[PDB]
Amino acid sequence: SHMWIGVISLFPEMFKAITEFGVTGRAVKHNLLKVECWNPRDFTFDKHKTVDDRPYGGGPGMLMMVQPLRDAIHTAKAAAGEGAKVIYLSPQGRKLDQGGVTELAQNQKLILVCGRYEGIDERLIQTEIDEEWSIGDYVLTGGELPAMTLIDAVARFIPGVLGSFADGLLDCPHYTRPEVLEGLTVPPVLMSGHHEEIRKWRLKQSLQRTWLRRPELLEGLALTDEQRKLLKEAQAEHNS
Amino acid sequence: SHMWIGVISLFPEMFKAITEFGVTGRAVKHNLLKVECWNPRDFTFDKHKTVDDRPYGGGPGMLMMVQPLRDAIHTAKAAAGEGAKVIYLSPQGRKLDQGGVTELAQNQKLILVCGRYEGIDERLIQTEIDEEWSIGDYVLTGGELPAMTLIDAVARFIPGVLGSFADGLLDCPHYTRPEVLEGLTVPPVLMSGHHEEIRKWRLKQSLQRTWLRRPELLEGLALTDEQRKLLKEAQAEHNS
Ligand SMILES: CN1CCN(C(=O)c2nonc2N)CC1
Ligand SMILES: CN1CCN(C(=O)c2nonc2N)CC1
């Protein structure tokens, strides 16, 4: 495959959501993407297959038990061979954005470690984890959805998986049939057949929407001469 | 149930990842959370159950077909009864963070619309959608993972679902057995049994980690006198 991703999770069946459906499911079926899961429960030795453990210092929660998680991680690393980057998903990690997705997608092999409970032993982060990433400033019940989100985002960069964050802007509005929907009409420019006017309209809309909704994103861009003009036009029309 | 969430998706089986496993799976089994899915494919009438359509103005992609998606949304609204907030997930939406999660969790009913392809008709956003939310500044292959992420995050607020974004800080490091792991020891304070010293250590660590990794998050906080002191201590030790 073109991208291999090993996953360490207590709930490997969750990953069916991306390996059996849609664009990512096609990528897996066609061997463009391989997702391989190891479950720490399988690396336990006690009768009840214990995968959590009490935190030193007390507190209300549990942590993942070190030995089964450590052994799972080592097994995944052995399978991966040389060059796999090991990632732990958590809110203490580097915040993911499309630039970070493009960076992560440069890797042919990733191992994604999915925390549950209050998380994992800090010393495992020091000894086993290459990078810590966050999918956003909110708290989930485990790292599985973040891992699946990251897999989905990077899969879009694998050649053959697909058939305006290309340029750091929000997307333009899109329209399809019918021509009139609850009294709302499709902008006539889009039915004009004028490819250049349509391209410019779309770009102007993207600039307007970014300015109105996410103005901080514009400050991170070096706008082209054309983008500067269309943004000025959109701002003047807003003030009209 | 305490929270009802209707979902509009071409891939309803993806939602098994949250309804059949872990904390969210328990919440569903115990009727604390209800997740109900409607698939636009079921609202088609042509032989091939067409759910996509061509965008006006051209371009490489497709959009969701209006009629089946609109009918699915209406059916979900009828099921929901009065007071359901309808949410479309996309990168053009309000960026989700834990504050936004706490806001969304105040709703007893939500309907989550999951886009595929290049998205949905802008006029459906105008006529059917109450709020647009984004789970982060990156692009996915559909709205299903964002929807599941949002469900998971809000489910944590339902009483009974659970057994440091409480205060806007990153989490402290956590440790569990064994006492020594690849030569790395557990901080002695955590094995002291001194509950107050442990609480203060944890808080100091959270302040230090937020300052080093996410300093912009500190500027949004009104630190307590205790937090100011511990942060000053951590900064002095860093400069020592
Ligand atoms: C223990 N577990 C807690 C929940 N968690 C996250 O909320 C998360 N992961 O990636 N980005 C995030 N935010 C992962 C770790
Ligand atoms: C059409 N579809 C494109 C992909 N998409 C997202 O990336 C997304 N959703 O919520 N936060 C996000 N970022 C949803 C809409």
CB < 8 Å to B171, chain A? 90-92, 119
> B233 φ, ψ to 5°?
-60, -45
Binding site for S-adenosyl-L-methionine, residues of B? Answer: 88, 115, 135-140
Q: How far apart are CA A106 and CA A103, in angstroms?
A: 6
How many angstroms away from the CA of A57 is the closest CA of chain B?
A: 4
Write out the two tokens for B38.
């409607």
Q: How far apart are CA A211 and CA A198, in angstroms?
A: 20
A47 exposure class (CB count in 10 Å sphere: 0-12, 13-18, 19+): exposed
Strands (E), chain A: 3-8, 33-38, 52-53, 63-64, 85-95, 109-113, 131-134, 180-181, 184-185
Q: What is the CA(A140)–ligand 1 centre distance, in A?
A: 5
* Residue from A185, A23, A99 nearest B115 by CA: A23
Domain locations in chain B as residue ranges: 1-164, 165-240
Query: For helices B22-29 and B144-155, what crossing angle results, to 10°?
Result: 70
Residues 147 through 186 of chain B touching chain A, CB cutoff 8 Å? 148-149, 152-153, 155-156, 163, 165, 170-171, 173-178, 181-182, 184, 186
Write out the two tokens for A154.
């990077």
> B168 φ, ψ to 5°?
85, 5
Q: What is the CA(B7)–ligand 2 centre distance, in A?
A: 15
The DSSP symbol for A61 reads: -
* Declared resolution, Å: 1.7
Q: How far apart are CA A129 and CA B157, in angstroms?
A: 30
> B4 φ, ψ to 5°?
-110, 130
Is B128 an interface residue toward A (CB < 8 Å)?
no
Q: How far apart are CA B10 and CA B118, in angstroms?
A: 14
The 3-class SS string of A1-55 reads CCEEEEEECCCHHHHHHHHCCHHHHHHHHCCCEEEEEECHHHHCCCCCCCCEECC
The DSSP symbol for A190 reads: G
For chain A, give the residues followed by a break (C–N over 2.5 Å).
163
CA distances from B125 to A180, B4, B17, B187 (A): 14, 22, 27, 53
* Residue from B120, B90, B108, B153 nearest B5 by CA: B108
| Ramachandran class of A59: left when φ > 0, alpha when ψ lies in -120 to 50, beta otherwise | left
Q: How far apart are CA A37 and CA A43, in angstroms?
A: 13
Residues 26 through 55 of chain B touching chain A, CB cutoff 8 Å? 53-55
At residue A81, what is the residue type?
G
For chain B, the residue count is 240
Residues 51 through 80 of chain A touching chain B, CB cutoff 8 Å? 53-58, 60-61, 63-66
CB contact under 8 A, B123 and A24: no
Residue A41 CB coordination number (10 Å): 16
**CATH 3.40.1280.10 holds for A1-164:** yes
Which residue puts its alpha carbon closest to atom 11 of ligand 1? Answer: A134
Q: CB within 8 A of A222, min separation 6: which ones? A: none
Residue A30 CB coordination number (10 Å): 13
B223 exposure class (CB count in 10 Å sphere: 0-12, 13-18, 19+): middle
**CATH 1.10.1270.20 holds for A165-240:** yes
| Ramachandran class of A185: left when φ > 0, alpha when ψ lies in -120 to 50, beta otherwise | beta
Specify whether the CB–CB gap between A175 and A185 falls below 8 A.
no
The DSSP symbol for A188 reads: G
Q: How far apart are CA B121 and CA A132, in angstroms?
A: 37
**DSSP states of chain B as a string?**
--EEEEEE-S-GGGGHHHHSSHHHHHHHHTTSEEEEEE-GGGG--STT---EEPPTT--S--EE-HHHHHHHHHHHHHHH-TTPEEEEEEEEEEEP-HHHHHHHTT-SEEEEE--BTT---HHHHHHH-SEEEES-SS--SBSHHHHHHHHHHHHTTSTTT---TTTT-PPPP---S-SEETTEEPPGGGGS--HHHHHHHHHHHHHHHHHHH-HHHHTT----HHHHHHHHHHHHHHT-
Probe ligand 2: pick from B139, B148, B151, max atoms within 8 Å of CB?
A: B139
Q: Is A129 in a helix, a strand, or coil?
A: coil
Specify whether the CB–CB gap between B59 and B119 falls below 8 A.
no
Write out the two tokens for A38.
């190891």
Specify whether the CB–CB gap between B66 and A177 falls below 8 A.
yes
Calculate Rg over the CA atoms of chain B.
23
Q: How far apart are CA B118 and CA B102, in angstroms?
A: 29
